[PDB]
Design a protein around this ligand. Sequence first.
Ligand SMILES: Cc1ncc(COP(=O)(O)O)c(CNCCCCCC(=O)O)c1O
Ligand SMILES: *Cc1c(COP(=O)(O)O)cnc(C)c1O
Lengths: 453, 451
Amino acid sequence: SSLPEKDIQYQLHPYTNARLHQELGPLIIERGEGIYVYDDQGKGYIEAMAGLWSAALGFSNQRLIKAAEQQFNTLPFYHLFSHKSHRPSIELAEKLIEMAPVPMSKVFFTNSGSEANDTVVKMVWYLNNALGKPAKKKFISRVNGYHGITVASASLTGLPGNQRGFDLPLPGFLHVGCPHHYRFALAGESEEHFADRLAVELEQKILAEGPETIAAFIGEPLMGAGGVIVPPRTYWEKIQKVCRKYDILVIADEVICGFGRTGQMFGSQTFGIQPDIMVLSKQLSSSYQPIAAILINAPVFEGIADQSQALGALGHGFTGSGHPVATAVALENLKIIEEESLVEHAAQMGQLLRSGLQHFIDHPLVGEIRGCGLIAAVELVGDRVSKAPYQALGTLGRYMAGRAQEHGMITRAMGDAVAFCPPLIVNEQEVGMIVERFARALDDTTQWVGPGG
Amino acid sequence: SSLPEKDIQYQLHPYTNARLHQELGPLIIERGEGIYVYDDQGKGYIEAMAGLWSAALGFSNQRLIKAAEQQFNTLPFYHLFSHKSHRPSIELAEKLIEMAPVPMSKVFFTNSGSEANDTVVKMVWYLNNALGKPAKKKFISRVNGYHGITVASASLTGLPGNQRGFDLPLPGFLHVGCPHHYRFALAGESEEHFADRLAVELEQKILAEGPETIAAFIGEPLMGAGGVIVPPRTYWEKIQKVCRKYDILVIADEVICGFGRTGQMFGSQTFGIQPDIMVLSKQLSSSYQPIAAILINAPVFEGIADQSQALGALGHGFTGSGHPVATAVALENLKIIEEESLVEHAAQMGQLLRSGLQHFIDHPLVGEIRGCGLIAAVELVGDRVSKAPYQALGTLGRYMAGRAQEHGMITRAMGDAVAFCPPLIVNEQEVGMIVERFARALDDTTQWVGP
Ligand SMILES: Cc1ncc(COP(=O)(O)O)c(CNCCCCCC(=O)O)c1O
Ligand SMILES: *Cc1c(COP(=O)(O)O)cnc(C)c1O
């Protein structure tokens, strides 16, 4: 019984067509080193996604591995319930609060981004009950946002693939437009006027729903899984004025943007967001351990704290909340990002990545090249004027990604956009290789389609 | 500035009164070894809870620590999305399926129990939509059950502490009786007749709701966080006959019971449960890594698989699903439990624990002593005839737990019950020490309550 046969036999894979998987089986990844991973045939791939937008320090950072060992050999597991605590969680929470781009009060730890956002939802409901506003419960998020996949966080999420078949979203989870100019702007509309229209949409939703019923607005500073969607100029400024106008919390989902991905330490800095709550994960630990953190500002903490007293204790927490190994690894991870000036380095590598891709700006199949910092995407189209896909939506993206993999590079297609989110430690010449392999995949795709013109 | 001051300054603690925490600060745990943990003053405590019902191999197992190192140095992170895979997840899934107490088809991994049960809820909804039964969505769980704390898993949960202030439960999450004879039986009613009445309650709920609307029944074989509640004789047999009668899935939440806690490898074995779905965590990895697993049987998998094809892909998964380090650690963990025959050893230590606690059966504040295997609780009361609490429910439990800690033992109070769920590696004399420290806490509690 071979290893692929066992995988087919025993594992139900996430984000995978189960029947198709029974036919093709897995691609088994055996080992990692630097920005590379190698399959069970010995073939090497540049992991241009950093796994899942996450492996900031790459796939063989010994300092993270040692930090884990040291913590294992001290205290391999403990918890934070009932006043219990431990050093790694305490020092990580300290670090996170002091590096926060706006004044923050407290950290709450979870294992995952989905748990974190699920927890934010509950916290907001608990908060507003504590403040005597029991109607103020609804969340507003965006079409194509991704915020995880619990019953509640999938309701925040605005990708239909996370909702069809699942009876989601739940009631009370509202959606407004995807701020993607290329796709949803009217013909000859400015970024700024698009932003205006989106802010008016949101004010209109709030009034139709009754402002007293709206608790919070949540958004990724720029949307990751939904297509590396950079919001238009002035979006965040104008969306926030609306939120403050009706006393609505602003939650920044920084699970992908956090820790140097967008050219600065947080997407909230890059895009001028003053969030009341931040959600962090992925680069927090370069995914070497599962860990997420929620940062809450003073007003949010004080209301929650009052209620936890009235009710005896805060009735919430995961067994793994603040896990000493995961928190110890994250702490070292963050120190490395500081000590090696990887935010600034990522910004530079991001400029290289983008320039390299921009040699293809006038290619007949390239509709848009977008990104900032060290996150980017190239959205392919069948026709540039109409912006229509070749064959069905997704066809080009799937073909590109398959070619890229053939050429030793792992990228994820989101419809017809192919994404780049490489490790922060990527060096100049590695950026070159990434772009080369993108180009070879585009070439193959171009021969396959035969654009002519 | 000092480490407690930082914790107070920067951390919001789960299951903690936040204001009281701003006053007292934390109890900082610095290191662990065997069944013990030590605070930052050097004081040692027997961890009679095994942390959170979870640290099966204790707090310094080098084999788990090595397995982690070896995996870290091979592949420290990867994922299972889009047909990607890796050895540890594959070999763990294999092991879990082959050791399952009933035929199972597939494993799906999450980080936590709460995520797991949340995922089970979605899977059941996805399944029944696939089968063209869009009305069949409601879950039935029990009062005082605990199944985690996401918006959906907290709705499954039946402890009001997890719901007050959170606008839970959601609609479609139904609750039937806690199967706790001591509290809910009528006078002089047998365990068997109590079980009959509970099965009738469930059939009646199903009919009142419309059977076509009921997707699933979920239960911990015995309830952990709700008070170490052992169901009465014949409960599970009779509850299952009702569920099969209306084609209702039976989900066993084995997050605590799993891997030797109840005298056998699974609570499903100990209590005669034939679940369609099982949820595992905690002792899965001795909590050295965050990991949970869902085991689904063939019919559940086949329906989901069909739908994931129709819809392009199964639109669900956590970044950490099947994390190579966490799965590698769990795999080694399970091997150790087998190689060291810890299920059988835990059973023996459980007999010692329970007989040691029984010396207090006639104490004026002891209302009930319960448990099986290596899980147990002593429920204190202010008055044995009336079963009423001293002052208010929880007052005794909070005092006991504080005294136990003073006497070098960490136990958790669930209301006025104090629990025992020590590491499986606990030895005979350590069981004695646990019982002795319980006894010293009870003495203190007894003098405190006074005349
Ligand atoms: C039976 C059961 N099922 C699910 C979960 C959730 O696990 P997670 O914490 O999400 O990984 C649990 C968890 N147990 C911890 C006990 C907390 C209850 C409060 C208390 O101990 O008083 C369990 O047990
Ligand atoms: C991947 C992701 C999540 C969910 O994280 P998990 O740990 O996979 O639950 C949440 N938010 C964003 C923006 C993400 O990209």
